[PDB]
Nucleic acid binder design. Structure first.
Ligand SMILES: [Mg+2]
Ligand SMILES: [Mg+2]
Ligand SMILES: [Mg+2]
Ligand SMILES: [Mg+2]
Ligand SMILES: [Mg+2]
Ligand SMILES: [Mg+2]
Ligand SMILES: [Mg+2]
Ligand SMILES: [Mg+2]
Ligand SMILES: [Mg+2]
Ligand SMILES: [Mg+2]
Ligand SMILES: [Mg+2]
Ligand SMILES: [Mg+2]
Ligand SMILES: [Mg+2]
Ligand SMILES: [Mg+2]
Ligand SMILES: [Mg+2]
Ligand SMILES: [Mg+2]
Ligand SMILES: [Mg+2]
Ligand SMILES: [Mg+2]
Ligand SMILES: [Mg+2]
Ligand SMILES: [Mg+2]
Ligand SMILES: [Mg+2]
Ligand SMILES: [Mg+2]
Ligand SMILES: [Mg+2]
Ligand SMILES: [Mg+2]
Ligand SMILES: [Mg+2]
Ligand SMILES: [Mg+2]
Ligand SMILES: [Mg+2]
Ligand SMILES: [Mg+2]
Ligand SMILES: [Mg+2]
Ligand SMILES: [Mg+2]
Ligand SMILES: [Mg+2]
Ligand SMILES: [Mg+2]
Ligand SMILES: [Mg+2]
Ligand SMILES: [Mg+2]
Ligand SMILES: [Mg+2]
Ligand SMILES: [Mg+2]
Ligand SMILES: [Mg+2]
Ligand SMILES: [Mg+2]
Ligand SMILES: [Mg+2]
Ligand SMILES: [Mg+2]
Ligand SMILES: [Mg+2]
Ligand SMILES: [Mg+2]
Ligand SMILES: [Mg+2]
Ligand SMILES: [Mg+2]
Ligand SMILES: [Mg+2]
Ligand SMILES: [Mg+2]
Ligand SMILES: [Mg+2]
Ligand SMILES: [Mg+2]
Ligand SMILES: [Mg+2]
Ligand SMILES: [Mg+2]
Ligand SMILES: [Mg+2]
Ligand SMILES: [Mg+2]
Ligand SMILES: [Mg+2]
Ligand SMILES: [Mg+2]
Ligand SMILES: [Mg+2]
Ligand SMILES: [Mg+2]
Ligand SMILES: [Mg+2]
Ligand SMILES: [Mg+2]
Ligand SMILES: [Mg+2]
Ligand SMILES: [Mg+2]
Ligand SMILES: [Mg+2]
Ligand SMILES: [Mg+2]
Ligand SMILES: [Mg+2]
Ligand SMILES: [Mg+2]
Ligand SMILES: [Mg+2]
Ligand SMILES: [Mg+2]
Ligand SMILES: [Mg+2]
Ligand SMILES: [Mg+2]
Ligand SMILES: [Mg+2]
Ligand SMILES: [Mg+2]
Ligand SMILES: [Mg+2]
Ligand SMILES: [Mg+2]
Ligand SMILES: [Mg+2]
Ligand SMILES: [Mg+2]
Ligand SMILES: [Mg+2]
Ligand SMILES: [Mg+2]
Ligand SMILES: [Mg+2]
Ligand SMILES: [Mg+2]
Ligand SMILES: [Mg+2]
Ligand SMILES: [Mg+2]
Ligand SMILES: [Mg+2]
Ligand SMILES: [Mg+2]
Ligand SMILES: [Mg+2]
Ligand SMILES: [Mg+2]
Ligand SMILES: [Mg+2]
Ligand SMILES: [Mg+2]
Ligand SMILES: [Mg+2]
Ligand SMILES: [Mg+2]
Ligand SMILES: [Mg+2]
Ligand SMILES: [Mg+2]
Ligand SMILES: [Mg+2]
Ligand SMILES: [Mg+2]
Ligand SMILES: [Mg+2]
Ligand SMILES: [Mg+2]
Ligand SMILES: [Mg+2]
Ligand SMILES: [Mg+2]
Ligand SMILES: [Mg+2]
Ligand SMILES: [Mg+2]
Ligand SMILES: [Mg+2]
Ligand SMILES: [Mg+2]
Ligand SMILES: [Mg+2]
Ligand SMILES: [Mg+2]
Ligand SMILES: [Mg+2]
Ligand SMILES: [Mg+2]
Ligand SMILES: [Mg+2]
Ligand SMILES: [Mg+2]
Ligand SMILES: [Mg+2]
Ligand SMILES: [Mg+2]
Ligand SMILES: [Mg+2]
Ligand SMILES: [Mg+2]
Ligand SMILES: [Mg+2]
Ligand SMILES: [Mg+2]
Ligand SMILES: [Mg+2]
Ligand SMILES: [Mg+2]
Ligand SMILES: [Mg+2]
Ligand SMILES: [Mg+2]
Ligand SMILES: [Mg+2]
Ligand SMILES: [Mg+2]
Ligand SMILES: [Mg+2]
Ligand SMILES: [Mg+2]
Ligand SMILES: [Mg+2]
Ligand SMILES: [Mg+2]
Ligand SMILES: [Mg+2]
Ligand SMILES: [Mg+2]
Ligand SMILES: [Mg+2]
Ligand SMILES: [Mg+2]
Ligand SMILES: [Mg+2]
Ligand SMILES: [Mg+2]
Ligand SMILES: [Mg+2]
Ligand SMILES: [Mg+2]
Ligand SMILES: [Mg+2]
Ligand SMILES: [Mg+2]
Ligand SMILES: [Mg+2]
Ligand SMILES: [Mg+2]
Ligand SMILES: [Mg+2]
Ligand SMILES: [Mg+2]
Ligand SMILES: [Mg+2]
Ligand SMILES: [Mg+2]
Ligand SMILES: [Mg+2]
Ligand SMILES: [Mg+2]
Ligand SMILES: [Mg+2]
Ligand SMILES: [Mg+2]
Ligand SMILES: [Mg+2]
Lengths: 122, 129
RNA sequence: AGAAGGUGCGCCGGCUAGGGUGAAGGAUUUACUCCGUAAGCUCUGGCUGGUCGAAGAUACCAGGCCGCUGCGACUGUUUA
RNA sequence: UUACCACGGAGUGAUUCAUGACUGGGGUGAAGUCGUAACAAGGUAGCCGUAGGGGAACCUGCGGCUGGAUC
RNA sequence: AGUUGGUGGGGUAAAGGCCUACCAAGGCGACGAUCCGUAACUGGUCUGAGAGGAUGAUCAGUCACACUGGAACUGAGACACGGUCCAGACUCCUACGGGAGGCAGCAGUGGGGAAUAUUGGACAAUGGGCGAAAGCCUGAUCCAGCCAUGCCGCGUGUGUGAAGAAGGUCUUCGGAUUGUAAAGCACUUUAAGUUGGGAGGAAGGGCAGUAAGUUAAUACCUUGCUGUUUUGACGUUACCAACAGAAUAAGCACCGGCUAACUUCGUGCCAGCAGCCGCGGUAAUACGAAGGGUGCAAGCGUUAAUCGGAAUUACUGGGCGUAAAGCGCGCGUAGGUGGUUCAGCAAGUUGGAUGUGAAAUCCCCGGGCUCAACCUGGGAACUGCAUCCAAAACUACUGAGCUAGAGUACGGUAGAGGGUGGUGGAAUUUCCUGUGUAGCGGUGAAAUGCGUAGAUAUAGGAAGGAACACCAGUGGCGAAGGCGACCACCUGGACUGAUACUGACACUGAGGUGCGAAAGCGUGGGGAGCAAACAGGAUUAGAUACCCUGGUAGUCCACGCCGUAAACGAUGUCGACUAGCCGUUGGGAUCGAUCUUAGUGGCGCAGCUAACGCGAUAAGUCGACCGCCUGGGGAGUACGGC
């Protein structure tokens, strides 16, 4: 682009949209489990993944992934969700925080048990 | 349509320097003459001559020294589309002083070294190294 | 499309602007002629007050309007 | 008593959000059904514009290109 | 439409359409008015080598607001944050007649939220209001409370200690590792604990005397000094000393590559992990544990967000033949840019001086808290703006020039350049007529179809429509699309030679304006051949195709519309330079040869390119202007305008 062409119309910055439209500029948000189900990953992977559909205080309805080996979420469970996309599951953009409000974290876990809300065995 | 004659002068010099020639001929003007003189004082050319007869022709004889030409990088700075001017503190250095940059000031067309010697900035015409 | 809807309108004063007709005068083609005319008569307006009543297009006269659809393009014709 | 004016009324428009019986395409999915259109001259050389036709990929006419093999 | 200007008048502390009555028809706008969305601004902050990008918490300056909408009064100052009046929404009291309220002041509550604290102390210090002075008030302020929220500092011990203890883990069963790590032995008491000492934040106020000045006066009063008395929320201050003892005080993430750190045991495409590549289906250094190790450390990780890396919006500092990307092609408006001489001017440009650019912050040299964070002195900086002085190379402006760009006048050359009429020959088809008789046509092979109602072939005549063999060429002309029979008429441009003339009149070009293959659309003609649609026959598993026999729109003409193409050299226009060789179309010169122009082709040195390849008809070296690109799909699609 020539100098005169740039004077008539200067260069424009593109804006990068967030990958987490819900929880608008928030670290975490709480919601209610409208249902808890289980789904199947994409092609190269084979498993049976646990997922909860959550309605947020925003009014948004999204899907979160439940980490760890076990969980105790059921209908009308109040949960806290954070960002983070699960690559295998299509449409899952959030993670459920273990051990915050109603999730209680995993049990019998002893290595790296701060991402799963587990107390020190002591 | 020759909206810049000085760029044509430098282009002719570079093109015929690359082609292993000895003399370059072009239409002359009182600015190209000053540029040729300041190059002569810097040892970048052999000699320059201005013809008579209403339509003067300026001819320049080149130098080669080794198997490689003396002028290896000559570039115009202030074009009719940009018109760059600089102060004394902002006069550019080419190759960290190993080259020369031609500056047009109210004291005439001279080199950047002479420009700081007189403490007068102006318009940066071209850089030669 | 007069879509829809709205505002003013009587009477008595003050100031003010135009048109038509038309004495006297002037011209020459001297006469069933041309120009032009003060008053009078007549027709259009403008902005400013005041005043009465419950109400001034006061009586007679004098469109109700709008939104979706079927049929037939329309004005016309037909079972006295 | 007049002038200015807030609230509030009446009529008719513009714009912008959410929602709507029912509909049109798109994307993503898994060992589903029908064909085989392209890639080799892909077995009728392929594409481009336009028109008609057909379960579908597509076929045919008219003009154009080589980003077409043998020679 | 008080909209823009003028006059007279009113009004204000003051200029002014601020207001009013007349007069005029003006004012703003592609240098973006009006309208829509969003948002207090700045000093600054964070990132970045810088240029930039993002952003206005805390502190400071300005502005606006005080339940919602109005209005004024009092006042030096208000349209008034704990004032008045009017109206509204929402709460409340009531003895039922009747009134009150405004935490976006400090604490505090409910609510919303992922999320942000005490109904604390004192006016001792600095300020503010009143008073003359004591003094009174002050949720400003100074201090405390809570919270790893951040930055900084310090602890959780130190030395010796090999049977290389016991246990755990691994193993080739020898051993290795945890590891001087532990135990044992000997030291020290920071911080916390207890006790005793102990500044600095303090200036002043009261009383008495003394000395000056005040007048008219040793009085009252103001001021100096002396003596006495009196003041602290913080506060059990900072700090200092003594006492006992190692006692009171380590966790989090990771270990396949990127990336420092590895082996076992469970599980078997499960359970699971995951920032990106990707691991897991029977020996998993990637899942879950255990031993070992690596990073940080009163913190460690995850999530959210900004900049960087990203030269990935490229001014510095990118590209467009084939990866995204040159408008189908011209003409031209605003704008951008301008061949060459003088002379002037001083807007741009350069240098200097002066004023300003708040403080704080960032940077340098210092000074204090035991260090640091923190506080603080001076400087530097604040790259800007404004006014004067000086210079004249370049750009701009003004006057006069010049002929190298551009154009005009005069003879010739070539050409499917365009338009309107007329006329030719070959051939196909159809109709009529003669001879003649059993096939014709078509295919890979067939069949449909045409034939004894006499076909095909053959001879003559007639009608009509369309295209223009041979010339014909890497040939020509045209802005592109495109343009081939011959002749006449009208008409544009280009090449070519000399002289004369004008004297920069030029290039590009957002918007706009036109021309623009084929197919298609409208009205009216025409219709031989061909031929979408369509019918029939084949092929085939099927054949809505390829093949065959027919065949309508259309293809042709006139006028109008449509605006598209692999509209391509996938290469914008204009100008200047840079080794050569072989052709060819027009034209010139000099003596078949040599030179020189304007096109059109083939190779090739430098140079360029990722490579292919381009290479005087650049994709090389450079200038001027315009258009366009920013991962693939969704999509050149939806909505809106035209
Ligand atoms: Mg993330
Ligand atoms: Mg009406
Ligand atoms: Mg009355
Ligand atoms: Mg009505
Ligand atoms: Mg109505
Ligand atoms: Mg209907
Ligand atoms: Mg009905
Ligand atoms: Mg009827
Ligand atoms: Mg009817
Ligand atoms: Mg009908
Ligand atoms: Mg009809
Ligand atoms: Mg009808
Ligand atoms: Mg009638
Ligand atoms: Mg009627
Ligand atoms: Mg009847
Ligand atoms: Mg109505
Ligand atoms: Mg309405
Ligand atoms: Mg409304
Ligand atoms: Mg709707
Ligand atoms: Mg709906
Ligand atoms: Mg429904
Ligand atoms: Mg095909
Ligand atoms: Mg195929
Ligand atoms: Mg094919
Ligand atoms: Mg086939
Ligand atoms: Mg092919
Ligand atoms: Mg298209
Ligand atoms: Mg086609
Ligand atoms: Mg068609
Ligand atoms: Mg179609
Ligand atoms: Mg077909
Ligand atoms: Mg067709
Ligand atoms: Mg074709
Ligand atoms: Mg007025
Ligand atoms: Mg006045
Ligand atoms: Mg006035
Ligand atoms: Mg605008
Ligand atoms: Mg706002
Ligand atoms: Mg950078
Ligand atoms: Mg910066
Ligand atoms: Mg920095
Ligand atoms: Mg801002
Ligand atoms: Mg604040
Ligand atoms: Mg302030
Ligand atoms: Mg100010
Ligand atoms: Mg202020
Ligand atoms: Mg101000
Ligand atoms: Mg204010
Ligand atoms: Mg308030
Ligand atoms: Mg409030
Ligand atoms: Mg108010
Ligand atoms: Mg009042
Ligand atoms: Mg009052
Ligand atoms: Mg007053
Ligand atoms: Mg105020
Ligand atoms: Mg007040
Ligand atoms: Mg107020
Ligand atoms: Mg205030
Ligand atoms: Mg208050
Ligand atoms: Mg009140
Ligand atoms: Mg009220
Ligand atoms: Mg009220
Ligand atoms: Mg309140
Ligand atoms: Mg408060
Ligand atoms: Mg607030
Ligand atoms: Mg709360
Ligand atoms: Mg809550
Ligand atoms: Mg918190
Ligand atoms: Mg607070
Ligand atoms: Mg005080
Ligand atoms: Mg008292
Ligand atoms: Mg208090
Ligand atoms: Mg702390
Ligand atoms: Mg924490
Ligand atoms: Mg905090
Ligand atoms: Mg052992
Ligand atoms: Mg101590
Ligand atoms: Mg003290
Ligand atoms: Mg003590
Ligand atoms: Mg490594
Ligand atoms: Mg892990
Ligand atoms: Mg295993
Ligand atoms: Mg890993
Ligand atoms: Mg593991
Ligand atoms: Mg973590
Ligand atoms: Mg993060
Ligand atoms: Mg982010
Ligand atoms: Mg991040
Ligand atoms: Mg950048
Ligand atoms: Mg990034
Ligand atoms: Mg970089
Ligand atoms: Mg650039
Ligand atoms: Mg690029
Ligand atoms: Mg370009
Ligand atoms: Mg391609
Ligand atoms: Mg183009
Ligand atoms: Mg092109
Ligand atoms: Mg174009
Ligand atoms: Mg254009
Ligand atoms: Mg155009
Ligand atoms: Mg196109
Ligand atoms: Mg042009
Ligand atoms: Mg111009
Ligand atoms: Mg010039
Ligand atoms: Mg100019
Ligand atoms: Mg000059
Ligand atoms: Mg200056
Ligand atoms: Mg400052
Ligand atoms: Mg120090
Ligand atoms: Mg001078
Ligand atoms: Mg025959
Ligand atoms: Mg014949
Ligand atoms: Mg062509
Ligand atoms: Mg056509
Ligand atoms: Mg058609
Ligand atoms: Mg037609
Ligand atoms: Mg027709
Ligand atoms: Mg036919
Ligand atoms: Mg056929
Ligand atoms: Mg046929
Ligand atoms: Mg036919
Ligand atoms: Mg049709
Ligand atoms: Mg035609
Ligand atoms: Mg073509
Ligand atoms: Mg193109
Ligand atoms: Mg391409
Ligand atoms: Mg072009
Ligand atoms: Mg070009
Ligand atoms: Mg041109
Ligand atoms: Mg050119
Ligand atoms: Mg050129
Ligand atoms: Mg070549
Ligand atoms: Mg290239
Ligand atoms: Mg390349
Ligand atoms: Mg340039
Ligand atoms: Mg340029
Ligand atoms: Mg250029
Ligand atoms: Mg995209
Ligand atoms: Mg995308
Ligand atoms: Mg996209
Ligand atoms: Mg479209
Ligand atoms: Mg859409
Ligand atoms: Mg549209």
């Amino acid at each position: 682009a020539t100098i005169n062409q740039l004077v008539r119309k200067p260069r424009k910055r593109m804006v990068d949209k967030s990958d987490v439209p819900a929880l608008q500029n928030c670290p975490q948000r709480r919601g209610v489990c409208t249902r808890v189900y289980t789904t199947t990953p994409k092609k190269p992977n084979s498993a049976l993944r646990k997922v909860c559909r959550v309605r947020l205080t925003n009014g948004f309805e999204v899907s979160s992934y439940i980490g760890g080996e076990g969980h105790n979420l059921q209908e009308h469970s109040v949960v806290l969700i954070r960002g983070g996309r699960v690559k295998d599951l299509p449409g899952v953009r959030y993670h459920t925080v273990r051990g915050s409000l109603d999730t209680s974290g995993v049990k019998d876990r002893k290595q790296g048990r701060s991402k799963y809300g587990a107390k020190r065995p002591k | 349509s020759m909206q810049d004659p000085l760029a044509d002068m430098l282009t002719r010099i570079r093109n015929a320097q690359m082609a292993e020639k000895t003399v370059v001929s072009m239409p002359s003007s009182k600015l190209k003459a000053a540029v040729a003189k300041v190059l002569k004082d810097e040892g970048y050319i052999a000699d320059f001559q201005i013809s008579s007869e209403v339509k003067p022709q300026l001819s320049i004889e080149l130098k080669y020294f080794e198997g490689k030409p003396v002028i290896e990088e000559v570039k115009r700075i202030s074009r009719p589309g940009l018109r760059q001017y600089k102060s004394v503190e902002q006069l550019p250095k080419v190759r960290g002083g190993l080259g020369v940059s031609i500056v047009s000031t109210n004291k005439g067309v001279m080199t950047d070294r002479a420009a700081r010697a007189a403490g007068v900035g102006g318009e940066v015409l071209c850089t030669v190294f």
